Design a binder for this molecule. Structure first.
Ligand SMILES: CC[C@H](C)[C@H](N)C(=O)O
Ligand SMILES: CC[C@H](C)[C@H](N)C(=O)O
Lengths: 245, 252
């Protein structure tokens, strides 16, 4: 758009605009995670606050912890909320009275194993829930009372919840998961698994977090930026027509 | 005549972005409301799921409803979660350890959160007001609870209005909210909250223009551009200096 002064003004403007919108998508991901972490932490505290007598028999776990799992599940509309024990049983409150299940192979599960290896909440990649066969993100936390492990708390939130939040955001924003597979997008057509993303991904590796870049699609110029948000990569892209016309 | 800058692609995109940022603030308000409404509905359902016999004596209400109020309060970090009864007593869960107890001196039957809930099938959302007990500004979500068609009481959930302010403050853009009385309520630039700020120019211009339509206005002899929109009872606005919208080659 010929005069370099004018092109620079258009470029600097769209850079700021697109960076702002990328930040909104970043914030969406952050807020989803923190809300779920706060919820999980509160549940941990309510369980650990029970007297040991209420925690040390399986029947007492069912009768005393079960209602807490159920109310918490309902309060945020979680898919499953549960407490896994070292005997391999798990008290499960599932969307459909919490029951003690012995058939869920919990010690083979990352949500269980990993919670025992950190003092933080553990957040799983999205995976297909065994019980309800929906894709979930699990927040898990080893619960201790007086330094004594009670069990591992788990909270399953449908990954579609995050996908829907991201899709509603302004801008042509999208998320890749930890394996660089498309996870969420404002334009639902981007969900085609056969779409190649090397151009934006290569541009991102060259430029780094939040650094605006140009790239090509079918010999046409586009502009974009990406940034790491936990294990995700969040991106925004647009046509470069805004600066070239 | 017409400002030539308004015919530029730069101006057009600038307004498109301001519109996008205003919509982010609109979404913030909508999502805060929806989340709190859903929480309150879930709580109602769990209370009403108690057997009728558990809901009809004060002792049974304390013992059976109280734990539910507490666990729900913790789950979302609400300020107060409570069940108001027709006898005027209220089972109140708030920060203080012990189990929820009945308070008999909170004058509930003449309060809007109570009376409005009885007039509707819906959740009632109050304008922000100073909480009677903890003296923080709160928004209350209330709902009449029925069991087998019989009124048990009115559920209330108090969320500090500061929670919504904090959400708005984190949003991009110079966005802000007015309440139902056209008083400043939340702002990205927390200086806009100070009572000495004159919001008449933006409000007067908004009245002439309607939702999402950009307008010029002035404050303290500075030309500005703004747009506002209704979001439930609130008015959400975004404004910018005219000299940022159109950066002069020579500054004044
Ligand atoms: C109780 C564990 C639950 C079912 C978890 N989502 C899993 O699939 O392992
Ligand atoms: C139990 C009612 C509570 C305190 C409510 N926030 C009020 O001020 O009326």
């Amino acid at each position: 758009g010929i005069d370099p002064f004018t092109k620079t003004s258009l470029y600097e403007s769209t850079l700021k605009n697109q960076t702002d919108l990328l930040k909104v998508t970043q914030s969406t991901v952050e807020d989803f995670r923190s809300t779920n972490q706060s919820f999980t932490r509160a549940l941990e505290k309510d369980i650990a606050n029970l007297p040991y007598q209420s925690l040390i028999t399986e029947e007492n776990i069912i009768n005393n912890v079960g209602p807490i799992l159920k109310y918490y599940r309902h309060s945020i509309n979680a898919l499953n909320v549960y407490l896994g024990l070292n005997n391999g049983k798990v008290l499960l409150s599932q969307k459909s009275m919490p029951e003690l299940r012995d058939d869920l192979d919990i010690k083979t599960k990352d949500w269980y194993q990993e919670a025992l290896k950190t003092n933080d909440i553990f957040v799983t990649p999205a995976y297909l829930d065994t019980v309800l066969k929906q894709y979930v993100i699990t927040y898990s936390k080893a619960i201790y009372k007086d330094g004594k492990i009670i069990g591992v708390l788990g909270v399953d939130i449908p990954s579609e919840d995050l996908q829907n939040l991201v899709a509603k955001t302004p801008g042509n924003t999208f998320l890749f998961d930890q394996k660089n597979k498309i996870f969420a997008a404002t334009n639902k057509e981007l969900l085609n698994p056969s779409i190649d993303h090397s151009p934006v991904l290569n541009a991102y590796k060259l430029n780094g977090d939040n650094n605006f870049f140009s790239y090509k699609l079918n010999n046409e110029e586009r502009l974009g930026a990406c940034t790491k948000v936990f294990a995700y990569t969040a991106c925004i892209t647009e046509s470069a027509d805004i600066i070239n016309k």
